Amino acid sequence: HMNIEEGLDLSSKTPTALVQRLVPSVFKEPKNILYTLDAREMRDPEHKTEAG
Amino acid sequence: HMNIEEGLDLSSKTPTALVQRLVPSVFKEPKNILYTLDAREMRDPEHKTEAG
């Protein structure tokens, strides 16, 4: 964005300072789900199917 | 703009005075924008492009 200046003679006027503004975009911490099945529980394959 | 007058003989009437009205229109002070680049900053064309 720039300033507006008035008149013909601008020798008294400061030029507009360019400002190279930057906005960050960042990944969050990873999002996870954990579950565990023991070797008895894994005898029924619906648990992995439904939990997945 | 004109005055209406009435009758066949107008010897006693006063003719309408033509008044020449004038409307002024004027330029404002010039509007300006100023920026500056040094010879290092000016190695990247995007500053001149985006500031323009």
Q: B31 - beta bridge partners? A: A6
Cβ separation A18–B35 shorter than 8 A: yes
HSE value, Cβ hemisphere, 13 Å, CA-based, for A34: 1
Determination approach: cryo-EM
Cβ separation B36–A13 shorter than 8 A: no
Structure tokens at B17: 């005075």
**Residues of chain B that touch chain A, judged by Cβ-Cβ distance less than 8 Å:** 29-37, 47, 51
**Which DSSP string do the residues of B1-52 spell out, in sequence order?**
------SS--TTPPPPPP--------PPPPEE------TTGGGSTHHHHHH-
| B47 backbone dihedrals φ, ψ, rounded to 5° | -60, -50
Tracing tokens 């720039």 back to the chain, one arrives at: A2
d(CA A20, CA A28): 26
| A6 backbone dihedrals φ, ψ, rounded to 5° | -105, 135
d(CA B2, CA B15): 9
Helices (H), A1-52: 46-51
d(CA B17, CA B1): 9
Of B33, B36, B47, the CB nearest to A2: B33
Of B30, B33, B34, the CB nearest to A8: B30
Nearest Cα neighbor of A3 from B36, B34, B37 is B34
CB burial of A8-41 (b: ≥16 within 10 Å; e: otherwise) equals: eeeeeeeebeeeeeeeeeeeeeeeeeeeeeeeee
For chain A, strand residue ranges (E) read 5-6
Closest Cα in chain A to B41: A18
Structure tokens at A15: 């030029």
Tracing tokens 């006063």 back to the chain, one arrives at: B14
